[PDB]
Structure 1
Amino acid sequence: PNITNLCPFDEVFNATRFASVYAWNRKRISNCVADYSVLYNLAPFFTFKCYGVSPTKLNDLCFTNVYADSFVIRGDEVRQIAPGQTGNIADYNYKLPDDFTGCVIAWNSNKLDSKVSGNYNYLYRLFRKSNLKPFERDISTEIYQAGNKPCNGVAGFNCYFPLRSYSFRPTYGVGHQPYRVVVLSFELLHAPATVCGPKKS
């Protein structure tokens, strides 16, 4: 039948500002029609690494809920948003499960997210005591203790502020330019799946 009520992918993809990778935004997508053919057909969206589902058959399989996690990282850590990899982003900021059903989308945003003075509004967590659970968000600013004496909240010797800043500049190499990453996770629940793609006449 005649289709309307498109899923709000424009508020996720064409947003003016994305969140930091430590405080990654999660948007739930339900009860709408999800046209994935727009994302595949845009040439600036260079990396379309989809895991657990084929990108050609994304338009027919229907899912219960779609989770859009949006953040900004550098060029070299785009490969770390994947199952089984390790590093600062995988351990401390955003961890993907090994049985991950969903696609990742990443594109360069050097024209938008870089300033000549340098952009300091984007932060990542560098030191955590334990590796993160999958899909866990940690927004704590407690002082990281690398030594033996207690820090007591004062960033002195062997006490570091756990969150640093990505100083994006329009003059950085491809491995240090800002990359906007949106991860779509597709989940099925005992509930009737109401997030489906369009049907052709």
Structure 2
Amino acid sequence: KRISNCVADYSVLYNSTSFSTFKCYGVSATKLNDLCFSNVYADSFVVKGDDVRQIAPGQTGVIADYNYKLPDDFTGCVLAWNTRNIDATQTGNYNYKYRSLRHGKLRPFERDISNVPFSPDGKPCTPPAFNCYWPLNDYGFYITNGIGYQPYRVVVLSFELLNAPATVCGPKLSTDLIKNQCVNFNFNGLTGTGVLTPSSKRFQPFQQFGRDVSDFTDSVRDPKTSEILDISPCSFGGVSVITPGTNTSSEVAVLYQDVNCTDVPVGNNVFQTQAGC
């Protein structure tokens, strides 16, 4: 199962469904939202209680190997929850069958829905034949059944991260704005340093990133809120010392040649000149 353009936060996951088993083998378990999923494979199935641990990377089981193989290569999550009532009946739900025995383990991300008798000699024969023995045996799923074969519903999310268009990719929390400050900025993956102000430039709606005759970025649309931000480079001046003759005295004064008396770190008195502060 592939999901698209959403968050997959664990908090909302918990309310809808509660997992008795909630563990990501290949990735972080809690941050199901952080991970940026592309062509994710959310694999839903029903297995008996002992088969729940069998279908897991690092542990190879005949039910796992010949029905839904989990080698270490994928990164994924096992999510099991108790569904005994729905998947079992006092008469017995024979809907589910397990391939208890098969010639070879499934390839990674390989499916087999075949119901054809297993050949012990390796040559398939007709089901009525004595030599061929069916691999798919019906699940023992009863309301009266004990934990040994009690039904449980397990989904394993196996995914190749960014092996396709990224689709389940949690949007991070946004430090949306800052005003009149030399800081770093990230316009939706556009990172730089400068002073930020509101922008009175009517960008064409289709284009979002600006540029200048100086070839630098005047302004660009805020992704979170489609409002434009003006960018200017941070202030840089050359400190120049004024002094009388060192013979005359030792006192000095400093000139900051292109900045107003605001941004100077700061000397008792300040005086702003057309030159600088």
Q: What's 1:173 paired with?
A: 146
Q: What's 1:48 paired with?
A: 22
Q: What's 2:185 paired with?
A: none
Please list every run of 5 or more consecutive structure 2 residues that lacks an aligned counterpart in the other structure: 175-277
Secondary structure at the residue paired with 1:167? coil
Deviation at 1:199, TM superposition (A): 4.1
Residue correspondence of structure 1 range 1-201 to structure 2 within 5 A: 27-40=1-14, 44-147=18-121, 152-189=125-162, 191-200=164-173
Secondary structure at the residue paired with 1:29? coil
Q: Output the amino acid matched with 1:75.
A: G
Secondary structure at the residue paired with 1:137? coil
CA distance in 1, matches of 2:126, 2:3: 39
CA distance in 2, matches of 1:175, 1:51: 24
Larger relative contact order (Cα-Cα within 8 Å, sequence gap ≥ 6): 1
Secondary structure at the residue paired with 1:105? strand
CA distance in 2, matches of 1:181, 1:190: 24
Over alpha carbons, which structure has the higher Rg?
Answer: 2
CA distance in 2, matches of 1:108, 1:96: 21
CA distance in 1, matches of 2:163, 2:99: 36
Change (3 A) 1:153 1:37: same
Secondary structure at the residue paired with 1:182? strand
Secondary structure at the residue paired with 2:49? coil
Q: Tell me the matched-pair count.
A: 174
TM-score by length of 1: 0.75
Moved more, 90-99 or 186-195: 186-195
Residues 136-186 of structure 1 deviation map (CA, whole Å, 9 limit, x = unaligned)? 1112233322248x6531433222122110031101111211000011123
Change (3 A) 1:198 1:121: same
Does the CA-based 8 Å contact 1:67-1:186 persist in structure 2? yes
Q: Output the amino acid matched with 1:48.
A: F
Does the CA-based 8 Å contact 1:51-1:100 persist in structure 2? no
RMSD: 2.4
Residues 26-57 of structure 1 deviation map (CA, whole Å, 9 limit, x = unaligned)? x2222333233233457841111211222233
